[PDB]
Design a binder for this molecule. Structure first.
Ligand code: NA
Length: 151
C-alpha cells in the first residue's frame, strides 16, 4: 500500500527500484516471505527488478550474482547485469501502468505484476513478453500495486 514488492522464492532476493532517467536507485534485502512497502510518486516511471546472491560487508562493498547494479551504490543507471527480469511502472497522479519484460535483458527471477484494480500480468519464464508494450493499466482512487517474485 500503495506499492508492495513481495518475495515468494525460497531464497533471499534484493529488490531494486530506480526511476528511468536518474543515475541511481534504492532497495532492500528481502528474505523468503518478506515484502517491501513503498510509497509512489505523483508522476514518473520506475524500473523494478530483483537481485540474487548479494554479498556485502559492513561498509559494504560487494556484488550480486544476478541483476547487480553497481554493487551497493545502485548507480548504472538502469542498466543492471544480464540476465535480469525487468519490471516497469509508470505513474500519473492516481493512475498506474505496469509492464515487464524477460527478453530485453534476459531472465533471472519469475515475476508477477498485479493491481487491486487491474488485471494480473504474469512473467514466469524467459520470453513472457511477445511484444512490447506488454503492460496492463490500473485506474482507481485507492488502488494497490504488487510485484511478486516466484509467484
Ligand atoms: Na543495496
Amino acid at each position: 500500500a500503495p506499492l508492495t514488492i513481495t518475495n515468494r522464492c525460497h531464497f533471499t532476493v534484493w529488490p531494486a527500484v530506480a526511476l528511468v532517467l536518474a543515475q541511481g536507485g534504492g532497495g532492500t534485502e528481502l528474505h523468503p516471505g518478506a515484502s517491501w512497502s513503498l510509497d509512489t510518486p505523483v508522476i514518473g516511471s520506475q524500473y523494478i527488478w530483483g537481485r540474487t546472491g548479494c554479498s556485502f560487508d559492513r561498509a559494504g562493498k560487494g556484488r550480486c550474482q544476478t541483476g547487480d547494479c553497481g554493487g551497493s551504490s545502485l548507480t548504472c543507471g538502469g542498466n543492471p547485469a544480464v540476465p535480469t527480469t525487468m519490471a516497469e511502472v509508470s505513474v500519473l497522479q492516481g493512475n498506474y501502468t505496469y509492464g515487464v519484460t524477460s527478453t530485453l535483458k534476459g531472465f533471472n527471477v519469475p515475476m508477477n505484476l498485479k493491481c487491486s484494480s487491474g488485471d494480473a500480468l504474469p512473467c514466469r519464464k524467459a520470453g513472457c513478453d511477445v511484444v512490447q508494450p506488454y503492460a496492463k493499466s490500473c485506474s482507481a482512487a485507492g488502488s494497490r500495486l504488487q510485484i511478486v517474485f516466484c509467484p
